[PDB]
Amino acid sequence: LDQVVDVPAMLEVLEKEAVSLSGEAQHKLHFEVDKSLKVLADEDQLRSAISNLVYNAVKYTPPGAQIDVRWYRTGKGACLEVEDKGLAIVKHALAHHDTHLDIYSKVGVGSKFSFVLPKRLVAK
Protein backbone atom coordinates (compact mmCIF):
# COMPACT_ATOMS: atom_id res chain seq x y z
CA LEU A 1 0.00 0.00 0.00
CA ASP A 2 0.77 3.75 -0.30
CA GLN A 3 3.34 3.40 -3.12
CA VAL A 4 3.22 2.53 -6.83
CA VAL A 5 5.88 0.01 -7.89
CA ASP A 6 7.01 0.21 -11.53
CA VAL A 7 7.21 -3.53 -12.16
CA PRO A 8 8.08 -2.97 -15.87
CA ALA A 9 11.15 -0.96 -14.87
CA MET A 10 11.90 -3.62 -12.23
CA LEU A 11 11.64 -6.35 -14.87
CA GLU A 12 13.95 -4.52 -17.29
CA VAL A 13 16.65 -4.42 -14.59
CA LEU A 14 15.93 -8.03 -13.62
CA GLU A 15 16.36 -9.15 -17.24
CA LYS A 16 19.93 -7.79 -17.36
CA GLU A 17 20.60 -9.36 -13.95
CA ALA A 18 19.32 -12.69 -15.24
CA VAL A 19 21.38 -12.64 -18.46
CA SER A 20 24.38 -11.66 -16.33
CA LEU A 21 23.70 -14.52 -13.92
CA SER A 22 23.26 -16.99 -16.79
CA GLY A 23 26.56 -15.82 -18.30
CA GLU A 24 28.00 -18.30 -20.77
CA ALA A 25 25.17 -20.75 -20.07
CA GLN A 26 23.28 -18.44 -22.47
CA HIS A 27 19.79 -19.09 -21.19
CA LYS A 28 17.17 -17.87 -23.67
CA LEU A 29 15.33 -15.47 -21.39
CA HIS A 30 12.06 -14.09 -22.73
CA PHE A 31 10.09 -11.29 -21.05
CA GLU A 32 6.47 -10.61 -22.11
CA VAL A 33 5.61 -7.52 -20.07
CA ASP A 34 2.54 -5.26 -20.07
CA LYS A 35 4.47 -2.00 -19.65
CA SER A 36 1.28 -0.23 -18.53
CA LEU A 37 0.74 -2.56 -15.55
CA LYS A 38 2.02 -1.15 -12.25
CA VAL A 39 0.90 -2.15 -8.75
CA LEU A 40 0.54 -0.78 -5.24
CA ALA A 41 3.05 -2.82 -3.23
CA ASP A 42 6.11 -2.83 -0.98
CA GLU A 43 8.94 -2.45 -3.49
CA ASP A 44 11.53 -4.32 -1.42
CA GLN A 45 9.28 -7.34 -0.88
CA LEU A 46 7.92 -7.43 -4.45
CA ARG A 47 11.38 -7.06 -6.01
CA SER A 48 12.59 -9.94 -3.88
CA ALA A 49 9.62 -12.14 -4.79
CA ILE A 50 9.95 -11.65 -8.55
CA SER A 51 13.77 -11.64 -8.59
CA ASN A 52 14.10 -14.90 -6.69
CA LEU A 53 11.66 -16.64 -9.08
CA VAL A 54 13.69 -15.51 -12.09
CA TYR A 55 17.05 -16.35 -10.49
CA ASN A 56 15.82 -19.80 -9.44
CA ALA A 57 14.73 -20.65 -12.99
CA VAL A 58 18.13 -19.62 -14.34
CA LYS A 59 19.92 -21.81 -11.77
CA TYR A 60 17.77 -24.93 -12.15
CA THR A 61 17.46 -25.06 -15.93
CA PRO A 62 20.28 -26.38 -18.14
CA PRO A 63 22.37 -24.05 -20.31
CA GLY A 64 20.44 -22.67 -23.27
CA ALA A 65 17.08 -23.57 -21.73
CA GLN A 66 14.17 -21.28 -22.57
CA ILE A 67 12.61 -19.25 -19.74
CA ASP A 68 9.42 -17.24 -20.18
CA VAL A 69 8.71 -14.37 -17.81
CA ARG A 70 5.28 -12.81 -18.17
CA TRP A 71 3.58 -9.83 -16.52
CA TYR A 72 -0.02 -9.20 -17.53
CA ARG A 73 -3.57 -8.35 -16.52
CA THR A 74 -6.03 -11.05 -15.56
CA GLY A 75 -9.57 -10.44 -14.40
CA LYS A 76 -8.49 -11.07 -10.81
CA GLY A 77 -5.45 -8.72 -10.64
CA ALA A 78 -1.84 -8.61 -11.82
CA CYS A 79 -0.17 -11.92 -12.76
CA LEU A 80 3.55 -12.70 -12.77
CA GLU A 81 4.60 -15.98 -14.40
CA VAL A 82 7.98 -17.67 -14.78
CA GLU A 83 7.90 -20.73 -17.01
CA ASP A 84 10.56 -23.17 -18.25
CA LYS A 85 10.53 -26.12 -20.64
CA GLY A 86 15.07 -20.08 -2.06
CA LEU A 87 11.27 -19.80 -2.07
CA ALA A 88 10.81 -18.71 1.57
CA ILE A 89 11.30 -15.05 0.72
CA VAL A 90 8.80 -15.36 -2.15
CA LYS A 91 6.14 -16.99 0.03
CA HIS A 92 6.31 -14.37 2.80
CA ALA A 93 6.63 -11.37 0.47
CA LEU A 94 3.50 -12.47 -1.37
CA ALA A 95 1.65 -13.22 1.88
CA HIS A 96 2.13 -9.57 2.84
CA HIS A 97 0.28 -8.71 -0.39
CA ASP A 98 -2.55 -11.16 0.36
CA THR A 99 -1.45 -13.67 -2.28
CA HIS A 100 0.09 -17.14 -2.63
CA LEU A 101 2.84 -18.56 -4.79
CA ASP A 102 1.36 -21.07 -7.25
CA ILE A 103 3.49 -23.78 -8.87
CA TYR A 104 2.35 -25.94 -11.80
CA SER A 105 4.31 -28.83 -13.30
CA LYS A 106 3.46 -31.02 -16.27
CA VAL A 107 6.05 -33.73 -15.62
CA GLY A 108 8.19 -34.18 -18.72
CA VAL A 109 7.00 -30.87 -20.22
CA GLY A 110 7.99 -28.05 -17.85
CA SER A 111 6.96 -25.95 -14.88
CA LYS A 112 5.43 -22.54 -14.18
CA PHE A 113 5.88 -20.37 -11.08
CA SER A 114 3.14 -17.77 -10.87
CA PHE A 115 1.18 -15.45 -8.62
CA VAL A 116 -1.75 -13.05 -9.00
CA LEU A 117 -1.86 -9.92 -6.92
CA PRO A 118 -5.38 -8.87 -5.81
CA LYS A 119 -7.09 -6.42 -8.09
CA ARG A 120 -7.26 -3.67 -5.43
CA LEU A 121 -3.46 -3.39 -5.94
CA VAL A 122 -3.62 -2.67 -9.69
CA ALA A 123 -2.60 0.92 -10.38
CA LYS A 124 -4.10 3.09 -13.10
Q: What is the resolution of this structure in A?
A: 1.9
- Which residues are CB-contacts of 99 (< 8 A; sequence separation ≥ 6)? 115, 116, 117, 118
**Solved with:** X-ray
CA angle 95/99/102 to nearest 5° reads: 110
List of domains in the chain: 4-121 (3.30.565.10)
Q: Which of 110, 63, 54 is nearest to 87 (CA)?
A: 54
CA angle 52/63/8 to nearest 5° reads: 40
Query: CA 122 to CA 124: how far, in whole Å?
Result: 7
